[PDB]
Amino acid sequence: VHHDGFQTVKATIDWEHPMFKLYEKAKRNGKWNPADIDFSQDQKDFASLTSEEKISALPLVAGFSAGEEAVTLDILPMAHALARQGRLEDVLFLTTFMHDEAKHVEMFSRWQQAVGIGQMDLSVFHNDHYKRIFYEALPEAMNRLYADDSPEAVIRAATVYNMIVEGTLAESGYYTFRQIYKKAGLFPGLLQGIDYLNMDEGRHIQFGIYTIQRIVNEDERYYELFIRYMDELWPHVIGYVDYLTELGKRQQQLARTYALEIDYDLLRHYVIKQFNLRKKQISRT
Amino acid sequence: VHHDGFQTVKATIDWEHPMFKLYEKAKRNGKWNPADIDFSQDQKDFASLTSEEKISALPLVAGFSAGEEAVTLDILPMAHALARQGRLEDVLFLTTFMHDEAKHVEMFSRWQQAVGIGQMDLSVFHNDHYKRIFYEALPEAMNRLYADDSPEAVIRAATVYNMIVEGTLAESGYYTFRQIYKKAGLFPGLLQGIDYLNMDEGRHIQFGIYTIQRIVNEDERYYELFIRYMDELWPHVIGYVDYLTELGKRQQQLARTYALEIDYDLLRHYVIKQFNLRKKQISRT
Ligand SMILES: CCCCCCCCCCCCCCCC(=O)O
Ligand SMILES: CCCCCCCCCCCCCCCC(=O)O
Ligand SMILES: [Fe+3]
Ligand SMILES: [Fe+3]
Ligand SMILES: [Fe+3]
Ligand SMILES: [Fe+3]
């Protein structure tokens, strides 16, 4: 369907729009290139490990690589829906969001290639709870926006994508990586990537907060929907977390070798903490 | 609809894919930030001009600002359609494409703001031929891809967007800017922007060539469709060009003041030249 006109012909960008400001910050802070990361020490680290130690790291990478690829593909309906609503500054910012996620896909895939597991199918580490979130609930909620851009649908999409996948799972994953491999002194290239991803993620989560809050601001009963959609996904969040913890507990050779008292009870509490603080970042009023 | 799996979990990025290579070049060559361009001399240049000289430059900027905004919004269905086909490297590259166009929208809108015309509605310089391309034919061809990603539809979308809007009109616009204002010594910030846009455009056009050629390669009768879709749009291409030429011929005070023998016959021939060389960049065989 046609364009009725163009904002930057009739007027200009809204330079004070929060999402224009975030776009500007993304340009300034988003120059890193996965192609510049030196993975040569990562290759040697991985080769030095025993088979039982090698596998320790793969469930988490399996979760991230699928996660990055899903969100790269699944942000497109959000960009479309806000575009169709004329929210030009949102769209400008979402171009940086999409490109960030492409670089994230690239980073993990370069690490897999470099350490010699690119040929390994890591889908075996996606349990039913993970698939419910990433293979199903995430694309369902985002693709809905092509035919239903109601405030309800937009809140649901931002909740699943920005508040759960990013704001709870990705953030806890970054913490888990540092708690384990930063301690061990392992995988410096991967951990450099993680630091860049974690910095990008701040803007992604801020977009979701802004999107959810601006809809809540119109009608404070959307606050209840946000909470409900958060709670709907929690069983799968913790179900996946419990599955990874069980795998960690059953393959402890990396932890012993590297003197990591890996506190899974504490990682579990960080996830709960993330989930609850994302809820608190939306105001009913 | 769901994800059946993820390429970077089952395997890796296809590192040798042409669109991965283009993505890599876009990261390396796409660091420029419109926010860094110094428009202060542009403001003084524009203020120095008489009213009749001021207006000389506005039809071309009106064409570009709407053009950039349209392509920012209208590339999203192409990204979606290739995503749904599993063409991950194409999608990675298209994130740089989208972000480039966002920066282009930003550049022209910053120039308009800086020279004091942000409040002026430049839609008056879009004639019927321009609207047929940008308000209608471009969004029609791109949005079709949401429900019809047939080789025919993809060739039509790439032809209108990459070969006509970018490969014929944008390229001729860059040439026109340099022929006029680079000569005059005017608007150094705008011309810096034009050089960055022209560099980005090379990758955009290369994406369209690759997309059209890979479909032609499957069935050489799609070559005829490419030619037909090019010729379908030519009347509006030249109809818009003739309209801008007529405006230039009727407001020659900038040209006199600045000693520009503006050769409109030569600009017209450059457009024809662009159109014909884009056709020659697709091989029937
Ligand atoms: C053992 C402790 C459990 C910690 C939780 C680990 C979760 C792994 C993360 C996988 C999903 C990554 C989602 C990426 C989202 C994005 O890139 O925006
Ligand atoms: C007077 C000589 C005519 C020269 C032709 C001028 C055409 C102006 C360009 C306006 C459309 C710009 C399209 C931008 C496309 C993109 O950003 O990829
Ligand atoms: Fe990410
Ligand atoms: Fe993210
Ligand atoms: Fe452009
Ligand atoms: Fe372009």
Contact B154, B167 (CB under 8 A): no
As a whole number of angstroms, the distance between CA A156 and CA B151 comes to: 34
**Which residues line ligand 1 at a C-beta cut-off of 6 Å?**
A 60, 63-64, 67-68, 71, 101, 104, 165-166, 169-170, 172-173, 176, 204, 241, 244-245, 248, 267, 271
Q: Calculate the alpha carbon distances from B175 to A275, B171, B191, B245, B271 in Å.
A: 54, 6, 11, 14, 10
Instruction: Kindly give, in sequence order, each residue whose CB lies less than 8 Å from that of residue A228, ignoring residues fewer than 6 positions away.
Output: none
C-alpha B72 – ligand 6 centre gap (Å) = 8
CA B24, B27, B28, B30 dihedral sign is positive
Three-state secondary structure call for residue B121: coil
CA B8 to CA B21: how far, in whole Å? 17
A234, HSE (Cβ side, Cα atoms, 13 Å): 16
A contact test, residue of B8, B71, B92 with most A CBs within 10 A: B8
| C-alpha closest to that of B29 among A191, A246, A33 | A33
Give the amino acid at A156.
R
Q: What does chain A come to in residues? A: 285
Ranges assigned E (strand) in B140-283: none
Between the CA of A101 and the centroid of ligand 4 the distance, in Å, is 6
The single residue listed with the structure tokens 């809809």 is A215
Cα(A53)–Cα(A46) distance, integer angstroms = 9
Phi, psi of B257 (to 5 degrees): -40, -45
Residue B150, classed as helix, strand or coil, is: coil
Ligand 4: centre distance to CA B192 (Å)? 33
Verify whether the Cβ–Cβ distance B9 to A121 is below 8 Å.
Answer: yes
Alpha carbon A165 to chain centroid distance?
5
Domain interval for residue A210: 1-285
Q: Using N-to-C axis directions, what is the helix angle for B222-250 and B188-218, rounded to 10°?
A: 160
Dihedral angle of Cα B64, B132, B117, B246, to the nearest 10 degrees: 90
Structure tokens at B83: 């995503």
Chain B nearest-CA distance from A285, in A, is: 33
Task: Residue B167: count other Cβ atoms within 10 Å of its Cβ.
Answer: 26
Experimental method used, please?
A: X-ray
Spatial distance between the Cα atoms of A164 and A144, rounded to a whole number of angstroms = 17
Q: CA-to-CA distance for A11 and B117, rounded, in angstroms?
A: 8
For B180, the enclosing helix (H) or strand (E) is none
Domains of chain A: total: 1
Tell me the residue type at A176.
T
CATH at residue A196:
1.10.620.20
Quickly count helices (H) and strands (E) in chain A: 16, 0
In total, chain B counts a number of residues equal to 285
